[PDB]
Amino acid sequence: RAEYVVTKLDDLINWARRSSLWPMTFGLACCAVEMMHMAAPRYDMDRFGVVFRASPRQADVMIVAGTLTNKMAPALRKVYDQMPEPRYVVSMGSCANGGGYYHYSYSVVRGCDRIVPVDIYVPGCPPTAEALLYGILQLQRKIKREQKLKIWYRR
Amino acid sequence: MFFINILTLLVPILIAMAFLTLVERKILGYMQLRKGPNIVGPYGILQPFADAMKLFMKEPSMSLFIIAPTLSLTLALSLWVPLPMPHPLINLNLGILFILATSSLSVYSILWSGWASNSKYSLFGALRAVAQTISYEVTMAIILLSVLLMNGSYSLQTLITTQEHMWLLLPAWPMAMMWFISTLAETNRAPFDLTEGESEEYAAGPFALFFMAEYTNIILMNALTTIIFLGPLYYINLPELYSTNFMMEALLLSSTFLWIRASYPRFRYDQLMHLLWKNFLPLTLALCMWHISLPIFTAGVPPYM
Amino acid sequence: TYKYVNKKEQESEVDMKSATDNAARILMWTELIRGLGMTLSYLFREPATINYPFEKGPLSPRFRGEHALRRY
Amino acid sequence: MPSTFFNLTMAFSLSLLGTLMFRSHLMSTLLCLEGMVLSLFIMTSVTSLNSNSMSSMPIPITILVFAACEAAVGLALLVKVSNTYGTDYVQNLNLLQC
Amino acid sequence: MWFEILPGLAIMGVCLVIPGVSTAYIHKFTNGGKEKRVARVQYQWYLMERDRRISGVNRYYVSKGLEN
Amino acid sequence: MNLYTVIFINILLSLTLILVAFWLPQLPFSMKFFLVAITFLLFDLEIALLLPLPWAIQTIKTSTMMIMAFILVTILSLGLAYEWTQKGLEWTE
Amino acid sequence: GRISAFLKNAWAKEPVLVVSFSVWGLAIIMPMISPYTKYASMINKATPYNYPVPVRDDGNMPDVPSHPQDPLGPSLDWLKNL
Amino acid sequence: MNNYIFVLSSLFLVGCLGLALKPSLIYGGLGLIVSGFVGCLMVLGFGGSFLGLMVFLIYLGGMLVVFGYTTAMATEEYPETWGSNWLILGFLVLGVIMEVFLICVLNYYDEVGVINLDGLGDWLMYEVDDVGVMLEGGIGVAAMYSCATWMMVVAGWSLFAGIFIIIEITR
Numbered sequence A: 001r002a003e004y005v006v007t008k009l010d011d012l013i014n015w016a017r018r019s020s021l022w023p024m025t026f027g028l029a030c031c032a033v034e035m036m037h038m039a040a041p042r043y044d045m046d047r048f049g050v051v052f053r054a055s056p057r058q059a060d061v062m063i064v065a066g067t068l069t070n071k072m073a074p075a076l077r078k079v080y081d082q083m084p085e086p087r088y089v090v091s092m093g094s095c096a097n098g099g100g101y102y103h104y105s106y107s108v109v110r111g112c113d114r115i116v117p118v119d120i121y122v123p124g125c126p127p128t129a130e131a132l133l134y135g136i137l138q139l140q141r142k143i144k145r146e147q148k149l150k151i152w153y154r155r
Numbered sequence B: 001m002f003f004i005n006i007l008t009l010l011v012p013i014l015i016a017m018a019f020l021t022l023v024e025r026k027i028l029g030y031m032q033l034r035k036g037p038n039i040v041g042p043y044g045i046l047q048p049f050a051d052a053m054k055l056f057m058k059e060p061s062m063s064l065f066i067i068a069p070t071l072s073l074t075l076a077l078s079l080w081v082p083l084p085m086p087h088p089l090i091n092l093n094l095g096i097l098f099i100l101a102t103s104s105l106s107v108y109s110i111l112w113s114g115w116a117s118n119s120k121y122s123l124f125g126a127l128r129a130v131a132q133t134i135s136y137e138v139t140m141a142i143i144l145l146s147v148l149l150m151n152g153s154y155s156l157q158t159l160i161t162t163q164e165h166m167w168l169l170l171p172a173w174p175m176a177m178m179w180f181i182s183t184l185a186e187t188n189r190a191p192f193d194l195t196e197g198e199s200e201e202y203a204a205g206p207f208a209l210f211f212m213a214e215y216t217n218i219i220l221m222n223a224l225t226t227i228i229f230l231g232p233l234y235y236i237n238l239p240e241l242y243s244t245n246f247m248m249e250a251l252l253l254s255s256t257f258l259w260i261r262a263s264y265p266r267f268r269y270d271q272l273m274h275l276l277w278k279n280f281l282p283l284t285l286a287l288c289m290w291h292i293s294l295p296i297f298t299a300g301v302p303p304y305m
Numbered sequence C: 001t002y003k004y005v006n007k008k009e010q011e012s013e014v015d016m017k018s019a020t021d022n023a024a025r026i027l028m029w030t031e032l033i034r035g036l037g038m039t040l041s042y043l044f045r046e047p048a049t050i051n052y053p054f055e056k057g058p059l060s061p062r063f064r065g066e067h068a069l070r071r072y
Numbered sequence D: 001m002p003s004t005f006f007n008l009t010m011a012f013s014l015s016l017l018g019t020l021m022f023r024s025h026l027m028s029t030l031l032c033l034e035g036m037v038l039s040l041f042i043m044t045s046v047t048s049l050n051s052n053s054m055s056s057m058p059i060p061i062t063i064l065v066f067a068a069c070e071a072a073v074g075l076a077l078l079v080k081v082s083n084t085y086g087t088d089y090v091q092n093l094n095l096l097q098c
Numbered sequence E: 001m002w003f004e005i006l007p008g009l010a011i012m013g014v015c016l017v018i019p020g021v022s023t024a025y026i027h028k029f030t031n032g033g034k035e036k037r038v039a040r041v042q043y044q045w046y047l048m049e050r051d052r053r054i055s056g057v058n059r060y061y062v063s064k065g066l067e068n
Numbered sequence F: 001m002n003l004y005t006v007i008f009i010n011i012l013l014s015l016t017l018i019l020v021a022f023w024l025p026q027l028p029f030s031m032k033f034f035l036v037a038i039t040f041l042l043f044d045l046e047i048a049l050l051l052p053l054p055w056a057i058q059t060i061k062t063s064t065m066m067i068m069a070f071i072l073v074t075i076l077s078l079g080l081a082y083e084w085t086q087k088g089l090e091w092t093e
Numbered sequence G: 001g002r003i004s005a006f007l008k009n010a011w012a013k014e015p016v017l018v019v020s021f022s023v024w025g026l027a028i029i030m031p032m033i034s035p036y037t038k039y040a041s042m043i044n045k046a047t048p049y050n051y052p053v054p055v056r057d058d059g060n061m062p063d064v065p066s067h068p069q070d071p072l073g074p075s076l077d078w079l080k081n082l
Numbered sequence H: 001m002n003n004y005i006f007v008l009s010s011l012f013l014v015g016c017l018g019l020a021l022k023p024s025l026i027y028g029g030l031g032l033i034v035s036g037f038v039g040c041l042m043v044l045g046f047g048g049s050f051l052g053l054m055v056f057l058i059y060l061g062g063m064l065v066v067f068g069y070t071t072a073m074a075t076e077e078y079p080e081t082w083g084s085n086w087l088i089l090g091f092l093v094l095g096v097i098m099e100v101f102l103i104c105v106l107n108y109y110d111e112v113g114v115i116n117l118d119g120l121g122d123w124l125m126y127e128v129d130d131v132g133v134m135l136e137g138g139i140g141v142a143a144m145y146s147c148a149t150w151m152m153v154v155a156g157w158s159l160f161a162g163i164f165i166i167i168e169i170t171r
């Protein structure tokens, strides 16, 4: 067949982009100690083929963690533009989803989803590294449920 | 025949480099008290292929852009040709000098990358790393020029018949303590990996090529040590045994590199160049003079077939 | 009740023995080798890692996460 | 032998032209000097190994070392020039005509 | 524990052991049970070209003996 | 022919890798650096002079080779020590 | 006393130079001492990288032998007796 | 594989020609590296293994490295590229055509002099010691340690002085 093996090929390339995940840990504030605790032994981010840290130009995922102010927004959008396609994003914390306890302040971006798009959301102040892993696995699944080759071969 | 042998020499070494990336991850994890990759496949024997597919999937002067990584990788692969295991693919007198040349060249790639990237930021680190690499390759060459006087020939086969009885470490260990270090600079490994420590232009593909060549050079310098200073057993009926012991000692050195990368901090550039210029070069010259005198105030002046 | 760190109880000596130990530790790298030994120790230990979806960390009844209204 | 030798001499002449004519730089001149030196070392080693002579081989080594040092001092001068003017151009040296 | 690295250690071991024995056995298959001769000098090359000329086949992996 | 084969093979393999990469998806001066490069030269030249010992040693004028080696090494070390004392290995600007 | 103090200082402050200079001295000095030095030149003279062209006997030279295996020539037995 | 030396020779010619037609230095240094490579290969084909490897190790690794180093750290390829490279490329093409036709002209007047084309492969090695060890350039270059010591001491002094000269210059 053709469509069968095309679906299988898409599933395999998704296997790749699902295992070889490299983050840029844009952790501004106290939603960062938890990323570090996660890459720590007891949960071992790397175990899932997910390196502790790495530069953007070779990265795939981008973890936002912390209040997103009006002086560190530009830099963030710059990084998300510099990064190479595909580029997946993960918001990690109240401050970065809805401005958290600083929503009604004057020097906050009330949601990183205004600056940048998003593929996953995570709640907390802070979250628990376990919930963070669960978000990342939701991301792996949001990957595994893609059909690029199918949509092209029926474009 | 020959194409078969070149395949046997090129495919397995790429396989080993991949699984060496793996072994690095695993040992670093086990020394930092974590596991490491255990998921993508049984005990993590698929993460490397995963990384390959991912990189080749990532989107991005073409001349430099291509010739630099290609050049580096080709040099790193050719470095393997003249090695004895135990009878080599290409027996070359002056083989180790060919090695040194083809190892020094990659500086051209390092430098073209910078001269292309207009980033002053990039030229900064490029110059720094180029200078350290140069300065350490100097001693990497002098050590051989001071040891090989034990076998009056730049070949790489004579090493074996020499070490038949004894090794080359019980003597010359004032050198092995160096040849096991400069190898950590030409490779830009730790504790001299500042070239990747201070960051403020390698895309996915060319990064894969650079890293391939890096770990290839790792394996190869470790093999060179295992051949020079850790002479294996050449019982002519057991080339298999030779290759086997060589494998063992190469793995041992390649795990020592990782002990190091995990344990130690990094060297500040100035402290590093101080280290070289004011600790290794005087010792190196004096020890070379020592090994020059040894075969004169001792009968041990070797032959040249 | 204060203290003193990074200071010798008095002036040192110039003993050939002390200079010898200093020279040795500067050449053969005893302390660095000790660090390598420590890393080896931790290598040969049990890792604290756990499989998350099949093993989940400890807690206490006082947690604070998802919300829930209730009923009689 | 004769063909390759005439071609090497041609290459020497071409480096000569490169040095005797400029294009608003100095590193080009010095690199053409290096090309000269390379051609000469090659022709000398070729002559030696073709005559099977040995005692005459130290000469390429000697002249290669001397060319290395010569180009080194030339680069030092180029650098002083760039650091006292602002670039390595050639048309800045309009002085000394008075 | 530390007994989970063998599935990479043994892999690298075999894939670094293969080239040596490969080369040896291949050279031997070609040159007929005896290893590949080497010529660091013109002497051995003269010997080899002599054996080539007298092989009767124009290949040097043939040692004749006393029956010539 | 053998090295030609090997090198062409390696180059073509690398270029296959890079073509895959491209198809599958679809300043002031620091005098110190120049001084260091110069030291590197003036040492490589010593290396060129010094390599031939494995054949200069099997001659009969040991009283000559021993000497000339000591001479080269010691005078090079003298130049090195002078550079040091005159602060070519300090890096502080 | 000043020398002794300086060396007792250097042997903790900067040994590298001490080791280097001691090695240098040993190298320059031992060749003048050891007895096994000349033997090297003797060996490398013995080693026949070329052919020993013979001569005639139109005279009364009694030193040179009429045969290799004869004893009338220069011996080197000390080589194996070494 | 008979035209070997002639090919290497023409390529060295072309490298020196690309240096004489002064291009942008970044695209001239490649010509120089090619020139050195091909010249060393010629030496090797003749039989100077030691000399060729000495070149690879010193010329390239020692001199071209520092040339690029100094160039980058002390030069800027200002926008003098008004298609200058694209012009001198066609100029180089015209020159190489001139040279090809020049040799095809010469071969008529001169046959056993400038170049012997019908028998080009011949006339590279003239004699050789078939049964002789110790006939490689290693011995000639080692001479300096037994005879011709003047060469070694002179080079030593050249370096001993070049150090002082460079340092006293840079200040």
Ligand code: SF4
Pocket: A029, A030, A031, A032, A065, A066, A067, A092, A093, A094, A095, A096, A100, A124, A125, A126, A127
């Ligand atoms: S949500 Fe809470 S834990 Fe996270 S960055 Fe904001 S204040 Fe810190």
